[PDB]
Chain length 160, copies 4
């Protein structure tokens, strides 16, 4: 962690209609270390000798359950790359533990979903709702921006 | 005649659990000369129609009501294929017009069946689809488009 | 204009550092058809038998002068497609004359620029500056949003 | 050997006024055994180093200080190439380790001189680049990365 950047993945869970239009964004609500509330995207490390899309698979099931039916993007190209730095103010992304370089994807879920393990809740929000300050505020390490870049990428960032 | 046409090209695929492309589907139909051709899911975007709605419509037009396409959330296409009515100008050509086609990978998760003019829908592995035999039957440089689709899916073979 | 969608391009003109990082965006100032002032991206139709990347070149020269030295992307993949509808409220994009389907690109310009023809001025703004309310207010047909999508794509959409 | 490494790959290109790729540049190198091999610009992203900066650094590292690379404004790479330490897991492989490589097309706008580990900087049109001769000389499947790059550029050759 103090030595090299970590390969991560961020997956923005979304509900889409038939045309692929993003209908809702799914945010996880868990507690911070001190029992304060936060909101996050599906985010996690890639393992040695693990493929990225597999990590995507593994992380989705972990946060949402084995019947979430993700549509893992046919293509490896992420919509962006979020560079979480251990020092704030360098990139829009920050994580106190490590320097993490994440391939970020929008991942539609075709199945049913529930919060698991450390995930207390799973909230489906419209783009307008997801981009409420109250919501964004609850997000950490700059994931609120990554969220906004995800919406922007899907052509559904709200004007407010 | 005088305007370039907005088009989409949809590349249907069977993906596995991890979204990895295992099969692509190619529509077998006849040319006006009655010659054999393989094809992508392709056509005009209508006036006042959304691109993603046109993907839905052409998919259904070619593959059926229950193909259950996964239309990409983002309008960012994998490439742009510009069919010029003059050969050699771009990798792509169409005798009828200048068409600017927005190309997408479209996973199909349901039952798919050849409709209207299409004679059959053939699912082929990437290694299969890129065999000289099949490619040779693709028109207007759509063979190049398929390779671009595969290259973008991390599945262009050697 | 009343029968088929038109193929358009939008180019977001930017100043970058050596690291490729977007430092400023170039907004043109001009009149609306009505006399009001607006701010515009570089935007226009692709001509019959004209390649898209060539339409990009043509529109850059046309708005910014022949020595702007744009870096046309090697890749035909736009960062988005902006679908300007002749009806407001259908997409985030609106044009009162046409249905335009536009392939949008961020275009760094490497040379000196000067606002041409009906362009009154050229404004170089930092992302913060470009996303000032008043600025985005001045944009038309949802181009303020397309600008945000462009900044989002570049990883430079402002928090505030 | 407990970690996957964050990597970049750069495909250096000469584009015309319209961004059209006219030639790609291949770096010639020696194998450990001293066979001749050709290469893209690839190397690690150091801790606390931004991707775009590692991109500059490895381009400068290989093409000299005058290459004037056009690093893309967008952090979206044209693809993500996974060199597994085991062959055949993905199209790419590297016995040294597991490298998650972010691939970009990088237009070079200036003088590019071969420096250090490289012996020769070979500029080749796309049709030249995909000659089985050339590709053969590429390791870790970079021949396949080179094609994906060309394909993404609309310039993959029909042979
Ligand atoms: Cl995809
Ligand atoms: Cl994505
Ligand atoms: Cl985007
Ligand atoms: Cl049609
Ligand atoms: Cl449309
Ligand atoms: Cl669309
Ligand atoms: Cl492309
Ligand atoms: Cl796609
Ligand atoms: Cl048109
Ligand atoms: Cl125009
Ligand atoms: Cl065109
Ligand atoms: Cl110019
Ligand atoms: Cl739109
Ligand atoms: Cl609209
Ligand atoms: Cl809308
Ligand atoms: Cl772009
Ligand atoms: Cl505007
Ligand atoms: Cl030129
Ligand atoms: Cl090109
Ligand atoms: Cl890719
Ligand atoms: Cl690239
Ligand atoms: Cl490609
Ligand atoms: Na214009």
């Amino acid at each position: 962690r103090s030595l090299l950047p970590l390969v991560y993945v961020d997956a923005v869970p979304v509900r889409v209609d038939e045309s692929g239009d993003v209908i809702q964004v799914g945010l996880l609500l868990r507690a911070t270390e001190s029992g304060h509330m936060m909101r996050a995207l599906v985010s996690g490390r890639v393992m040695y000798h693990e493929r990225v899309r597999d990590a995507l698979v593994r992380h989705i099931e972990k946060d949402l359950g084995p019947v979430a039916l993700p549509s893992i993007p046919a293509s490896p190209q992420p919509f962006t790359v979020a560079e979480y730095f251990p020092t704030p103010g360098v990139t829009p992304f920050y994580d106190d533990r490590h320097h993490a370089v994440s391939l970020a994807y929008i991942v539609p879920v075709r199945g049913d979903c529930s919060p698991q393990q450390n995930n207390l809740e799973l909230t489906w929000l419209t783009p307008e709702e997801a981009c409420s300050p109250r919501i964004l505020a609850h997000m950490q390490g700059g994931q609120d921006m990554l969220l906004k870049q995800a919406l922007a990428h899907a052509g559904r960032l709200p004007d407010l």
